[PDB]
Amino acid sequence: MRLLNGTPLALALPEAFLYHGASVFTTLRAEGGRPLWLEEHLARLRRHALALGLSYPGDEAFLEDLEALLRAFPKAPCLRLRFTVGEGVRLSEARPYAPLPLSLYREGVRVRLTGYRVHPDLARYKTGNYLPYRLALEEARKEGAFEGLLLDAFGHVVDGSRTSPLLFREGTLYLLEGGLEGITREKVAEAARGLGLRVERGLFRPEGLRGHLLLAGSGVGLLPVRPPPPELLPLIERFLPACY
Amino acid sequence: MRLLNGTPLALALPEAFLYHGASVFTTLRAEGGRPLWLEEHLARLRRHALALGLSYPGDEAFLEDLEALLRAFPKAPCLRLRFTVGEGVRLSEARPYAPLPLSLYREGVRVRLTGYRVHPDLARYKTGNYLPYRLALEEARKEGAFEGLLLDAFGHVVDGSRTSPLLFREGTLYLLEGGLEGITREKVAEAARGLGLRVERGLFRPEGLRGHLLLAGSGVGLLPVRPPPPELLPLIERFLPACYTE
Amino acid sequence: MRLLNGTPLALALPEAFLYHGASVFTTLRAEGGRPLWLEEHLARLRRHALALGLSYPGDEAFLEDLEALLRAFPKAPCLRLRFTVGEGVRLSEARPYAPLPLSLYREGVRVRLTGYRVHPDLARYKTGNYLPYRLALEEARKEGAFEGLLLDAFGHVVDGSRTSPLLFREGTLYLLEGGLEGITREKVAEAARGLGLRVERGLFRPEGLRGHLLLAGSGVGLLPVRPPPPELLPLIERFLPACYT
Amino acid sequence: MRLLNGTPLALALPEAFLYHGASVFTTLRAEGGRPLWLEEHLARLRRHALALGLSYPGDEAFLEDLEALLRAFPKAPCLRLRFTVGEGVRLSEARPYAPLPLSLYREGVRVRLTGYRVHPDLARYKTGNYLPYRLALEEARKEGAFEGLLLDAFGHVVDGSRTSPLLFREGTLYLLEGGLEGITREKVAEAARGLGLRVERGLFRPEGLRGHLLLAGSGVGLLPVRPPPPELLPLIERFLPACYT
Ligand SMILES: *Cc1c(COP(=O)(O)O)cnc(C)c1O
Ligand SMILES: *Cc1c(COP(=O)(O)O)cnc(C)c1O
Ligand SMILES: *Cc1c(COP(=O)(O)O)cnc(C)c1O
Ligand SMILES: *Cc1c(COP(=O)(O)O)cnc(C)c1O
């Protein structure tokens, strides 16, 4: 017997999935009824599932799900999509996307460096064990900061709770190493190279983070921390959600 | 809109609970209708919930649940119970308990040391972020072992996937630090003192594990790794689940 | 008094060089009497010596040793040269180069990912503290592989025991950071860009080694791990040791 | 062919020993001709050699060397000895011990905390890859510190260049983890338990080194950093080298 808030509760989702965070996921934005970088997301999700010993449902199954989801909210310019894989479980959902105010891309947001660490074994996978990231964001919100930053076991700053951090300093856009290989950040790097900007990767500690931070992710595009450097205005423009 | 395996889904539990493993829990054994260390489990569960910013629904609600569960199994020699807290979630469940073979407590089990780590910030809490522990047990079982052991960031051996490791050498019982403070382990410590055994806590590296390993947990009692020494027979007896056919 | 294998011995070398691995070095290939990338090798040896507080004997001294070594092996199609610097020690040596079976450049070799680590302070320098590299190669050879790969303290795969690893995917060549800045790897990178390929540098975890691996160094040129990707065929040709004639 | 400073040098020592720091070693003190803790030193040298794939030649080969060495000091003053093992290499040596000023065992010495790291794999062994230690000691000596301390990859303080650190705080003697398990430090730990003191191992950061630091090593015995705490006076006296009368 199993009770939820006093009331008997039946089956539905497997225990591993519900009780143990035993899943991998990804989140995409759809714009004009077209998901951004669908292939990249499915290729990553498949890699993550396989690395954690989950069967991947196959692209066709997700494409099928997408046929229904894309029409779920006809009055919204954009959608937030989530694709989630667990043993016995393909969970695909959609909700209206609510863009940040444009003024946040012009004026920038704040970040909070937290003391929370990524998992040494899971940090490179987008998994249901998300508490360290949720906790980091909770800490950040406690100061109205937009994003919280996490560390590895060595004290490097390696990730945001839901965005990938970049640092612009000297003449150079740096991608912080050590965390999730974010799709948005790789596209940003690609676009920055495409514009003749200097792009490099590096492992950073908090004391090395001098210059302008930015945050990339499927939920936000490219979001500057504090007022952006002028050199990156066009790069930010290019990744602004098309949702106004 | 949500689809489960292609078919629409009216989701019963909150998003974060399912998607983020955002929960704390505890698992208890009941013997002949009586829950073991109920006070300690509810104390820990509240402590873990408060540490992780999750609303605790109160002892009474859980004790209400408990009566119902116990009523559903009036004949069961033993039960495994589980109490889980998330935001907007009070989950309480019970199912028949089945013991390990009695010989295991005499002849002992195998462990496998794995390369999986606990989370630096959540290791002390019993949370829904339980994947490393799953992976550790999966590795152990692949290798024909009963339990998989996990490391901290520095390579200390700090936990089992669902049991708490102890080391016994000469006349002292060591509790290995850096993992979950298991309730069973603390009880085992308590009983060992009462036996005229000394008890110390420390951080141990694999090579520091000289002596007899044992495993403590709510689901097993106290289980020796390999045959136990007779200095521990008393302790093994005391914690052996009272759950074999009448 | 010092006994070597029971026999009293007056040390020809200073204790630091011998007991403590206190040296920097480089190994070059000479092809038909001409050293490959001599300028690069000597500039790096100087940089490394100075970085570690070792006095550098000057290029002219090694140039003189080089000629002396060349004179000694007038027939050899290729030579393996080692120039080593320690305090009060210039050591220059040569032996005939032993070319790999030519088919390895077509069929590729195997690598073994090992658990050996490079040193946090010395990974960037080519030093006589070389035991972790030898141990990695030992393990690789015990497992039937050609090269062993080493990690950094953080878990990235950052080096091979005597070659620099490269990863090709999609249409970009990645140089693995964290280990020695090899001369051959830099040359391959420059050549790859000239062939129209994108080149990127990053720290990679073992798990992240998706695509084709290759190995670069003065001892091998550019050697593929398993059969190469088509895109890199011209680079394998360009860097092939000219040592089969 | 090898050239040493332009002059042909004859083989003598194998490449791995010579160029790669591929050795394990231990250093002993002898007082009146008998080496302290000879069995422990030899047992450890054997374990270190085996762990690193180096053939250990047997205790008797070193004992034969020892007899040869002792023959050349009939006077039997204190001796500093070193036993070194590489592949095809057994090196044994002895020279007069140089005692520290007696005053240092009551006054204590200074240490310098360096940024040099130990090697992740080799920190637990006493090997020829000794450059980080050398470098740490050189830094210490620039400011008149007796010893330089080294870190691990996390920033823990895990060893001295040639001595093992201990920390005494409340009434507990701590052995700093992460470096070589010194013979002297284990002996000290044993004697400390016999005095009814508690002894624990701990992994320490620089912040956490509050209390009395001490250094243990086959050369120095037990050597305090700053004046020592009274509880430890008997241990300093037990381990003070018998090389002053
Ligand atoms: C999703 C996520 C990101 C951003 O990745 P994208 O693929 O750009 O959406 C960054 N960090 C963490 C921890 C994430 O979960
Ligand atoms: C539950 C659990 C234990 C055992 O704790 P008890 O309170 O004795 O039941 C040990 N390790 C882990 C990881 C656990 O989840
Ligand atoms: C010498 C060496 C290489 C190869 O470098 P090159 O300069 O290309 O010859 C690669 N890795 C290690 C560890 C080396 O010592
Ligand atoms: C030799 C040594 C010590 C001291 O060891 P003993 O066995 O006590 O002589 C401490 N640290 C390092 C790095 C050493 O090499």
mmCIF file of C-alpha atoms and ligand atoms in Angstrom, chain C residues 25-28 37 41 44 118 123 125-127 130 133 147 150 159-165 179-186 216-219 221, ligand 3:
data_model
loop_
_atom_site.group_PDB
_atom_site.id
_atom_site.type_symbol
_atom_site.label_atom_id
_atom_site.label_comp_id
_atom_site.label_asym_id
_atom_site.label_seq_id
_atom_site.Cartn_x
_atom_site.Cartn_y
_atom_site.Cartn_z
ATOM 1 C CA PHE C 25 65.323 17.185 -22.449
ATOM 2 C CA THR C 26 64.080 16.962 -25.942
ATOM 3 C CA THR C 27 64.140 14.179 -28.528
ATOM 4 C CA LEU C 28 64.452 14.894 -32.236
ATOM 5 C CA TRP C 37 62.570 21.359 -36.423
ATOM 6 C CA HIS C 41 63.478 21.972 -30.269
ATOM 7 C CA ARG C 44 61.768 24.773 -26.158
ATOM 8 C CA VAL C 118 50.936 13.974 -15.110
ATOM 9 C CA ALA C 123 53.299 18.543 -16.949
ATOM 10 C CA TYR C 125 57.837 20.762 -19.232
ATOM 11 C CA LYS C 126 59.845 17.939 -20.799
ATOM 12 C CA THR C 127 61.735 16.814 -17.671
ATOM 13 C CA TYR C 130 59.440 10.868 -16.356
ATOM 14 C CA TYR C 133 54.989 8.315 -18.563
ATOM 15 C CA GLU C 147 50.741 4.123 -26.414
ATOM 16 C CA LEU C 150 47.773 9.914 -18.875
ATOM 17 C CA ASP C 159 48.948 13.307 -22.735
ATOM 18 C CA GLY C 160 50.501 10.113 -24.100
ATOM 19 C CA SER C 161 53.711 8.728 -22.698
ATOM 20 C CA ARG C 162 55.781 10.045 -25.660
ATOM 21 C CA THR C 163 53.231 11.485 -28.110
ATOM 22 C CA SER C 164 50.587 14.226 -27.989
ATOM 23 C CA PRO C 165 47.011 13.080 -28.520
ATOM 24 C CA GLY C 179 50.066 18.047 -20.983
ATOM 25 C CA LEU C 180 53.240 18.919 -22.830
ATOM 26 C CA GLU C 181 53.022 21.429 -25.650
ATOM 27 C CA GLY C 182 54.525 19.189 -28.218
ATOM 28 C CA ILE C 183 56.287 20.558 -31.244
ATOM 29 C CA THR C 184 54.776 17.960 -33.620
ATOM 30 C CA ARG C 185 51.230 18.656 -32.450
ATOM 31 C CA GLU C 186 51.623 22.432 -33.120
ATOM 32 C CA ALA C 216 51.800 13.209 -32.762
ATOM 33 C CA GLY C 217 55.458 13.371 -31.776
ATOM 34 C CA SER C 218 59.072 13.560 -32.980
ATOM 35 C CA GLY C 219 59.375 9.771 -32.586
ATOM 36 C CA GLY C 221 55.235 11.977 -36.892
HETATM 37 C C1 LIG E 3 58.246 14.415 -26.035
HETATM 38 C C2 LIG E 3 56.829 14.206 -25.623
HETATM 39 C C3 LIG E 3 55.819 14.310 -26.567
HETATM 40 C C4 LIG E 3 56.074 14.661 -28.012
HETATM 41 O O1 LIG E 3 56.424 16.019 -28.205
HETATM 42 P P1 LIG E 3 57.182 16.495 -29.555
HETATM 43 O O2 LIG E 3 57.668 17.882 -29.135
HETATM 44 O O3 LIG E 3 56.135 16.560 -30.649
HETATM 45 O O4 LIG E 3 58.301 15.558 -29.910
HETATM 46 C C5 LIG E 3 54.512 14.129 -26.144
HETATM 47 N N1 LIG E 3 54.250 13.827 -24.851
HETATM 48 C C6 LIG E 3 55.220 13.691 -23.936
HETATM 49 C C7 LIG E 3 54.861 13.330 -22.521
HETATM 50 C C8 LIG E 3 56.540 13.874 -24.312
HETATM 51 O O5 LIG E 3 57.520 13.724 -23.387
#
